[PDB]
Symmetry: D2
Subunit: 295 residues, 4 copies
């Protein structure tokens, strides 16, 4: 037998950083969960009990805190690139670093219509994420994403004209509820190294904001023919607005809300045009994926 | 042996209701999870396998949907009171109904600075809850609550002057992070029945809004001497603003963020006045409770 | 306003303890999650920012580890009583301690039909729990429980003869699946203090084992007329086997498995006597409770 | 823009099946959660709102139940292969099916030392899983796995001799706790189609049992030099015992248990050789992966 692939590191490293403005007294907080996995010439730790090649996972944890102390943690694309680059430059035998960051929301509170200097609220479990792969000699690959954005529209969704055969019981519909949890990922063109990532720093927050805005507006305004059709419209718009993106991937559950026939009870009408009360279904759920790139 | 207490019913009943405005085309959605447990002269179902006294839990589920079809589902205090009253009036041998409702957030989307007619976002896992106990001959007891409101302030929290003995290692501090998940419950004076609950309908949403506003403002503005002291200030304000409330209960975790000493690494300064990077602790957590009533 | 009730302490304190046998080399591990909440003359911490009355929650955490170091941690009824007694005896102004312990399973591995000296497996998320309330002048109240015991029987469960009215759609049945997660709690007679708890130490593990055995055997063997009827049989047996128990409480979800009618597809028969494939329902679920005491 | 990749289907489909033995009266239950995602000539559903190419996800759900009715559901490798093959054969334009199955434990109860005919217990959240990719013209690729196997050993784990630099604070150790949740995956050689999968049916359960046995025995008996070294020993043994496996992948968290220094309290000794009470850490955790193949 032989080691075909190996990676190891530290997962679930929670990090908080505060920035304090001297002049204004305003404080800004950032909270993330970080995972770093390393690859390189480490096979002998597995095959020969040779620990000399192991940068301890505990040391990886220390490095994450030290790096956060000495560098900006925002945008996360930059922080992840700094962190990954550190490992491949510091350790001769480490040749790839894989950095995953999940950013948690701490949104500044409005108290009496004024933004508060040091108080924050977690407005939703929506996350902003990055995956950064730093590979020696091959540059920096960054995938940025938003996840956990949960939306619902109560009308202007349709689903008809699908394949009907002996396995089909679903009725066609011209008016249904559509609800999903949005997972959207945009993959940047490969960057040659840290200097190039630094050169594009303003694009990272702007593109995240664009992706979120396009997702919300398209969902709200499309008279949706299917999840498939609406998601494609979202992806093509993001690609049009940011030339440094190579692909956009969406993964959308279809979280079903079923009509409840109440006609057995005193002829109560609660279906079709008379549907008011529905039963949200926890499972199963449709799952629709697509990756859209350039022609 | 004897049955000392018994209750049974249906839990985790998910309900969605849509309201459609004829004139304006605006739609409004409500989504809840409902539990109904009944008590009464039902001991023989346990002791004698006498099912004749059992209103099937499946029928309780049907009743919840039918009641939501025929009545407003908001405010939840009203819906819960209607639902509980139904059971004690319909069934001679049922003498108490216990209704728990959790309301999930579906907040109308703003698209281009305009509220959208039929699109919604789940902005946070904060819930609004009610517990309604309808007891034959004894009226309607309602406890209203908010839960899952997660906040953090990065300064203006202190904790010093506590008891120090041979079990104590905690350093006194004049500047720390304070973060919590707010659970706040206000208990209404007993209502004589449904007519009285109806008479106070406008107070329910207003008091919820007040409780939320007082909680956020007090948290943000108090130079906190302890969780204990800040929570008491919140409770006394709510009691002052709504005379129909008898008690307010808060239950607050203290979600700790620890300083990280980095001085072992090149004398890096990251404690006290120099603290920038902290380690959020998943566990353990302080837990502080108090119930405040009138003198 | 006035403080009507207050308690505070430390939750989610994870503790592991190992015992090493000198002679045999056998090791035994215990892992628990502990919560301790205190009550007493502490109102001024809430009302006057007087921290002098506060035993810091951090110190409570330290105390839990120190107490586990100096005392047996099994049975948990004993450990909880030692821990609660410590607080009311050490601190003049603390008058009640509330201790909740959850015990996690670490079951010794069998390797080649021989018990291994120091290797363990988590065989299920079933827990053994205790709630110990130590109240100055009023002794020690202990509630012991098992939870998270998930079982299913595929036949020998019935449900017919229930109330039928205009809200009822459920068909009577003489053969259904019954599945539940067992939560069972037995409440001990009040103990005068630690000496009395020590005197009954052997009864704690024995009664837990009895409660578990009676629950499993009764579930497996009863031709169940309802959840209500089967649960009562369990409770009456436990009360008969241990005279120091005052009440037994069961709380059982009814986790539904629905028949799937496939007759629309080529006349496929999958209902009643021909039912083979079922759809487990995540929600809603029946919830049936009862507390059984002595005549 | 262009569709680069697309797949869609139904996730979280819960399925239960019962087998009833005519002669003996013994019943056996199987419960699974199934996901099926399809690929093929479906781009126009995304780009042109052409639903004619969509096999509705609801129909996929129906197909899963029908297939479970008409076929064995065990071993899951076989069921997944039958299910995936159905889609590529039935629908001209569907060219790949991806089937993921999670099998839940229902272990027959022993009552009075005798196996019960129809009563079952969920003994742990350990799962047996399969991923089956059926690709038209390219055969059937099967990855089998176990997950959620949680183990701990209280001694006979070491970790010393690792890289030490200015980022390192970890002390070397010759005696520590090792605890992990095992995720192990074995990838079968490609099968030409369903006939070949059928020909190897007995190997599937046998190899699962072998993988589990090798994992438990190696964990218990290895005087572990690191997670890396112990996991490699497991993988090489599985590859040696089953020639039809091409690779074995392990993914292991290192779930840390920290010593607690109590020496500040009355010189209490709780470190090194005197360590009895430890603090389980919820996060962060080491994460160690490796894929082992043939030379
Ligand atoms: O077994 C281990 N492997 C590692 O890579 C490591 N790093 N810190 N502790 C560790 N333990
Ligand atoms: O065992 C049962 N008890 C009940 O109260 C009930 N109601 N519906 N089905 C039921 N099954
Ligand atoms: O606000 C606090 N209250 C307390 O009771 C406490 N104990 N430790 N830290 C604390 N902080
Ligand atoms: O939007 C949808 N896409 C689909 O593929 C599908 N299948 N059933 N319902 C559906 N809705
Ligand atoms: Na390198
Ligand atoms: Na009544
Ligand atoms: Na006392
Ligand atoms: Na095909």
């Amino acid at each position: 037998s032989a080691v075909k692939a190996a990676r190891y590191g530290k997962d679930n490293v929670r990090v908080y950083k505060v920035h304090k403005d001297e002049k204004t007294g305003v404080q800004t907080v950032y909270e993330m969960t970080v995972c770093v996995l390393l690859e390189g010439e480490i096979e002998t730790s597995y095959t020969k009990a040779d620990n000399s090649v192991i940068v301890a996972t505990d040391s990886i944890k220390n490095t994450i805190y030290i790096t956060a102390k000495q560098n900006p943690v925002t945008p996360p694309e930059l922080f992840g690139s700094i962190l990954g680059t550190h490992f491949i430059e510091k350790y001769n035998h480490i040749h790839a670093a894989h950095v995953n960051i999940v950013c948690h929301r701490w949104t500044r509170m409005d108290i009496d219509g004024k933004p508060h200097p040091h108080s924050f609220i977690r407005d939703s479990e929506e996350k902003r994420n990055v995956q950064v792969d730093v590979v020696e000699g091959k540059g920096i690959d960054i995938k940025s994403s938003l996840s956990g954005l949960t939306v619902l529209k109560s009308t202007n969704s349709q689903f008809w004209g699908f394949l009907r055969d002996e396995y089909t019981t679903l009725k066609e519909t011209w008016d249904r509820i559509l609800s999903t949890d949005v997972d959207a990922t945009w993959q940047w063109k490969n960057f040659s190294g840290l200097q190039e990532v630094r050169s594009h720093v303003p694009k990272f927050d702007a593109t995240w904001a664009t992706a979120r805005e396009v997702t919300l507006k398209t969902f709200a305004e499309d008279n949706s023919a299917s999840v498939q059709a609406t998601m494609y419209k979202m992806a093509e718009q993001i690609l049009a607005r940011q030339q440094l993106i190579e692909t956009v991937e969406y993964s959308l559950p279809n979280k079903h809300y079923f009509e409840i026939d109440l006609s057995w009870h005193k002829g109560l009408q609660n279906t079709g045009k008379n549907a008011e009360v529905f039963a949200p279904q926890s499972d199963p759920n449709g799952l629709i994926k697509c990756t859209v790139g350039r022609s």
